[PDB]
């Protein structure tokens, strides 16, 4: 409650501590004081050091396992169970939804041509005419796919992006954090990298976490980037700070990772955590096969390429929804402004696509990934098969000991991050937490309450803004772990200092 003029905001010991929250495709970062974070394209271009080598580009929407034998039947099967969970459900008036047809929709679809909006986009590729070894975030978006540049994407699945080939290794890996961390502090924070010697940082960190990793990152930024102490937290103990739900069960649903576990008092219990390798980006790719069905009008879009990407992507974020109320076939627009192309805008029709798509995160079998690691659980059939999102959050609540942890679970679900974004998202899981819950507790417990704006905030910034709330905390000042400490015992410190069990 001590509120600060602003002559001297700049002086308290928060202003002096640095946040940080990596993602397999936003970093999030800023001082402690911030009240937005800085939020980057979590990438970095590098160029080649020799005529003639071959391009390498990370995937993004792209991934193992998409194309197997079975891939096409499991996709099929999954969108049968989508389907039947969407008839199953009626509408607000009582009725059923009267499906509609993707190939009505292509009848009028592929007869629609786009019109110009403007002779030029109006976007252009990041310029590298002076040679710039390296480019990030938003500049390595776009660079030109002609020119010699390697893409790489540090984070995948939430997991350190390792890999066979060049920036694949773990020391490029850290190498390219590195890179990318300290050019956003430099930046947006606008910090001169020799003064991170009178900061101190709070590292964000999966619920759960690389043991090797996480020591590798504590090495590189005391040793490597010059902070003179660092605080490590799990991403899903910070989210439950920012919203000020002291006990709840978390799920935070990324691009790429999706994660569930419960929470009590600053403590993640270990034998609720789940992680699921499916987030926004599969519903992103997902949404583009939905629609081609529906004879989609850009049709030389693909996959590979990080232009057309960000449009699936924003496409999703624009038409997705999970409302049983929106429905029939409606007419929509969007714009394309690609660099080296017009400004387009195209008019087409849309179905239920709009609503398949996003449901696939509760029948992720739709997907078709087949013959990969698709469930984790903390330190195998249950691991193969993938693990809708409602199921994973039943089966972690009844994973704690005592009924009443369970009582608070169901009673509060918190869901976080940016790849449950979609409208009517909070009513539409609460639904099918309460039908699919054990009917015991159902009635033992006043409601279920799932809770999506927290605050009314934006669900991205919850954990970013939970590890800032984080150091302004009592408890904290004993968690700090500094540089000479780090450099005599290493590892050590994390055993014997980490807020949770190392
Ligand atoms: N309005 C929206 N509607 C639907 N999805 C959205 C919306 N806004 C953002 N998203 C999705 O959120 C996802 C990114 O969320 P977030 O930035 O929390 O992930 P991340 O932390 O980079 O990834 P991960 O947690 O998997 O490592 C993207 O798939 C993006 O499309
Ligand atoms: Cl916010
Ligand atoms: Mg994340």
Redesign the pocket.
């Known amino acids: 409650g001590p509120l600060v003029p602003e002559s001297l905001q700049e002086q308290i010991q928060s202003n002096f501590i640095i946040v940080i929250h990596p993602?397999?495709?936003?970093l999030r970062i800023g001082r402690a004081t911030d009240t937005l974070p800085a939020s980057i394209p979590?990438v970095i271009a590098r160029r080649h050091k020799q005529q003639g080598q071959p391009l390498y580009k990370d995937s993004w929407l792209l991934r193992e396992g998409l194309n197997k034998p079975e891939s096409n039947e499991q996709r099929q099967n999954g969108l049968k169970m989508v389907d039947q969970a969407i008839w199953s459900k009626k509408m607000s008036n009582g009725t059923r939804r009267i499906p509609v047809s993707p190939e009505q929709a292509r009848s009028y679809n592929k007869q629609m041509r786009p019109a110009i909006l403007d002779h030029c986009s109006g976007n252009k590729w990041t310029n590298t005419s002076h040679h710039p070894e390296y480019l990030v975030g938003e500049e390595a978006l776009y660079v030109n796919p002609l020119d010699c540049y390697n893409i790489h994407w540090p984070?995948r699945?939430?997991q350190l992006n390792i890999h066979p080939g060049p920036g694949g290794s773990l020391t490029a890996v850290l190498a390219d954090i590195e890179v990318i961390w300290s050019h956003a502090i430099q930046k947006y924070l606008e910090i001169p990298l020799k003064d991170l010697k009178y900061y101190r940082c709070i590292l964000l960190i999966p619920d759960i976490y690389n043991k090797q990793h996480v020591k590798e990152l504590v090495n590189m930024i005391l040793m490597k980037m010059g902070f003179s102490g660092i605080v490590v937290h799990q991403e899903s103990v910070c989210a439950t700070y920012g919203s000020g739900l002291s006990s709840t069960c978390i799920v935070?649903?990324?691009?790429?990772?999706?994660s569930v576990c419960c929470v009590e008092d600053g403590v993640s219990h270990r034998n609720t955590r789940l992680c699921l390798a499916y987030?926004?980006?599969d519903?992103?790719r997902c949404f583009y096969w939905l629609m081609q069905r529906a004879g989609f009008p850009y049709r030389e879009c693909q996959l590979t390429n990080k232009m057309d990407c960000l449009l699936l992507?924003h496409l999703?974020?624009t038409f997705?929804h999970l409302d049983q109320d929106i429905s029939g076939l409606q007419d929509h627009e969007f714009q394309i402004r690609h660099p080296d192309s017009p400004a387009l805008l195209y008019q087409f029709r849309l179905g239920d696509e709009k609503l398949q798509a996003p449901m696939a995160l509760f029948y992720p079998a739709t997907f078709g990934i087949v013959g990969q690691k698709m469930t984790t659980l903390q330190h195998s059939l249950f691991e193969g098969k993938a693990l809708g999102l409602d199921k994973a959050i039943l089966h972690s609540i009844d994973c704690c000991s005592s009924d009443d942890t369970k009582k608070k679970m169901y009673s509060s679900i918190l869901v976080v991050?940016?790849?449950?974004?979609?409208h009517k998202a909070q009513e539409f899981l609460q639904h099918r937490i309460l039908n699919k819950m054990p009917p015991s507790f159902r009635r033992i417990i006043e409601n279920v309450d799932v809770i999506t704006r927290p605050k009314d905030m934006d669900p991205?910034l919850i954990a970013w803004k939970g590890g800032a709330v984080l150091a302004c905390l009592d408890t904290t000042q004993e968690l700090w772990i500094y540089q000479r400490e780090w450099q005599r015992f290493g590892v050590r410190m994390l055993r014997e200092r980490a807020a949770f069990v190392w």
């Open positions: 993602g397999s495709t936003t979590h984070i699945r939430g935070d649903v990324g691009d790429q990772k999706t987030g926004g980006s519903v992103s992507q999703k974020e997705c991050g940016g790849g449950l974004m979609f991205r």
